[model samples]
Target: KVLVLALYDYQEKSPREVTMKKGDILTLLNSTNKDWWKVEVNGRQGFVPAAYVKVL
Candidate 1:
């Protein structure tokens, strides 16, 4: 199952880039600190700040 990140402290300039919409599944990979979720989207990987995402 995958989740959507609704909020975050993303380096991206706009919410269109930072927010992942529903039905999108971000693969759960190994994280650096081990709290935030690591996801692969469009080839590049980034951390999904745990504050906004809900598992589906």
Candidate 2:
């Protein structure tokens, strides 16, 4: 797993996605998708936009 930092606030558009706040730290689970990545935050695991997060 990898650590990441949220660069912008993101509200999940679907049930499969996770909402994120700017500056929130997240645990990266998968990055196979170029645009979206799987991550965990606050005990919830789901997809987030790759562009909204930066690798820590």
Candidate 3:
């Protein structure tokens, strides 16, 4: 499951009102080995990270 790491409160499973972009500061509160990650940036939420990009 993807977790949200942001400065605001988040509802599990629910879409966040924020999203995180490249060079954004994110903290991994809980994560899996999967390349996809759910991050919170500002007030929007979405998927990102190296795994989603399949880079490294």
Candidate 4:
């Protein structure tokens, strides 16, 4: 599980924008990237900064 901290739209980097709020829940898609993780939020999937998330 992942929590949406802030808004992100890496454009050319992300496949989708995946607009979300601060307390939104994000589902992890994979654990491969060192700095970015593939996640699904609100039916929209995309990449977000690994640094912005708190993994458990």
Tens-digit lDDT string for candidate 3 (1-56): 33333333333343432344444455443245474455544554455543433222
* TM-score to true structure, per model: 0.42, 0.95, 0.37, 0.60
Candidate 2 global CA lDDT score: 0.96
- Output the number of the TM-score-best candidate: 2
User: Lowest summed-lDDT stretch of 10 residues in model 1?
Assistant: 8-17
Per-model lDDT: 0.50, 0.96, 0.41, 0.59
Comparing 1 with 2 on TM-score, the higher-scoring candidate is: 2
Residue-level lDDT for 14 in candidate 2: 98
Q: Order candidates by lDDT, high to low.
A: 2, 4, 1, 3
Of the candidates numbered 2 and 3, which has the greater lDDT value? 2
Local accuracy of candidate 1 as per-residue lDDT tens digits, 1-56: 36444443344343423335444555544345444666655465666655445454
Q: Model 1 segments beyond 4 Å from truth? A: 1-19, 31-35, 54-56
Off by over 4 Å in 3: 1-20, 27-30, 52-56
| Clashing residue pairs, backbone N/CA/C < 3 A, model 1 | none
| Tens digits of lDDT, candidate 4, 1-56 | 54444344333244553455555567777658897766676788877776555554
- With a 3 Å backbone cut-off (N, CA, C), the pairs that clash in candidate 4 are none
> What TM-score, to 2 decimals, does candidate 3 have?
0.37
